[PDB]
Paper text:
In this work, we describe a novel protease of S. canis, termed IdeC (Immunoglobulin G degrading enzyme of S. canis), which may be involved in bacterial immune evasion. We demonstrated IdeC is a cysteine protease that cleaves feline, canine, and human IgG between the hinge and CH2 regions, defining a new virulence determinant for S. canis. The structure of IdeC presents the α/β fold characteristic of the papain superfamily of cysteine proteases, consisting of an α-helix followed by an antiparallel β-sheet comprised of four/five β-strands. The active site, the canonical catalytic triad for papain-like cysteine peptidases (Cys-His-Asn/Gln/Asp/Glu), is situated at the interface and involves residues from both domains.
To enhance crystal quality, a truncated form of the inactive IdeC was produced in which the first 48 residues were removed (IdeC_T48_C94S). Crystallization experiments with the truncated IdeC produced new crystals in the cubic P 21 3 space group that allowed the structural determination of this variant at 2.25 Å resolution. Comparison with the IdeC_C94S structure revealed a high degree of similarity (rmsd of 0.376 Å for 229 Ca atoms superimposition), although notable differences were located at the PBL loop, further closing the cavity and blocking the substrate binding site in the IdeC_C94S_T48 structure. No sulfate ion was found in the IdeC_C94S_T48 active site, which may account for the different conformations of the PBL. In the IdeC_C94S_T48 structure, the PBL is stabilized by polar interactions involving the main chains of His253, Tyr255, Ile260, His262, Ala320, and Ala321, as well as with the side chains of Thr254, Tyr244, and His262. Additional structural differences between both structures were noted in loops 63–69, 186–194, 226–231, 301–304, and 309–323 and in residues 125–137, which form a small β-sheet (β−3 and β−4) in the truncated IdeC structure. Minor changes were observed between residues 86–89, 160–163, and in α−2. Similarly, we conducted crystallographic experiments with the truncated form of IdeC and the IgG-Fc. Unfortunately, only crystals of IdeC alone were obtained.
Residue numbers in the entry: 46 to 336
Write the structure that this text describes.
Amino acid sequence: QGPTSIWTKGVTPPTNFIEGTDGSHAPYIANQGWYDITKTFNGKDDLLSAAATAGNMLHWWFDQNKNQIEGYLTEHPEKQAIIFNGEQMFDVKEAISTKDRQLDSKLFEYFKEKAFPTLSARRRGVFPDHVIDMFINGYRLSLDNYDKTPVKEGNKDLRGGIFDQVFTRGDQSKLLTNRYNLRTKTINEISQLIKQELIAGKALAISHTYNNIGISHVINLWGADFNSEGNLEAIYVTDSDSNASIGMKKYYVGVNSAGEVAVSSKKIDSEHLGAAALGLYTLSAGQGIWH
């Protein structure tokens, strides 16, 4: 009969929550284990919600794997930088140094400027698991694939494969990502999945319907509140579309009038149907796998 709460491994719950114009938010504080990559809307990042979300999860991943990554980069120093012909496009140490920045992290800068510079202009986006599977394992990110990454040997995507000397292509046990359909699932099914993935020590992203830019939006899910019945009541999220001053938002979770498990900055109501939950993406730290 008590309302229990569960946070992502290595994240300090914010407590600075203030009433805003639409719902409760906790402005971002550095070095608390969560991340809030924020779009500038510069032409290039406008439709990269998924790449921002993947970036936030990769920032979290850098924290989980700090020692393992510094070990790896000494054993394989050629994997530190990415070069296209003559030019250094990316340096992973630069990404790690700048991981605390909402607006000007080198990781999101790489994504919007070098990896996916044309996708926004072409009214196109990505899936956050594809971005991670590219960045870590070197799996080729295809604009034609709307399902999971095909787990098969193949050429390193030139835009990534930094950790592909440990997290190889075509080996299921070295795949760190997963995705789950939430559409038409019950509050109990969605709640147990999110519970399980959080207690398992995964980073989480959730997609919901969007009544604007695209049709779906993906955000980072850092924490959840579960009621007396074990069902989600609220989630704590960062949203790349929210300006840098917002930070962590509290969304109510419930079953709306239309029978959808929905998220809303306001309590689910006869007057507030929120946005339908569509998908869940997870990232493992992969701590079994190093060495």
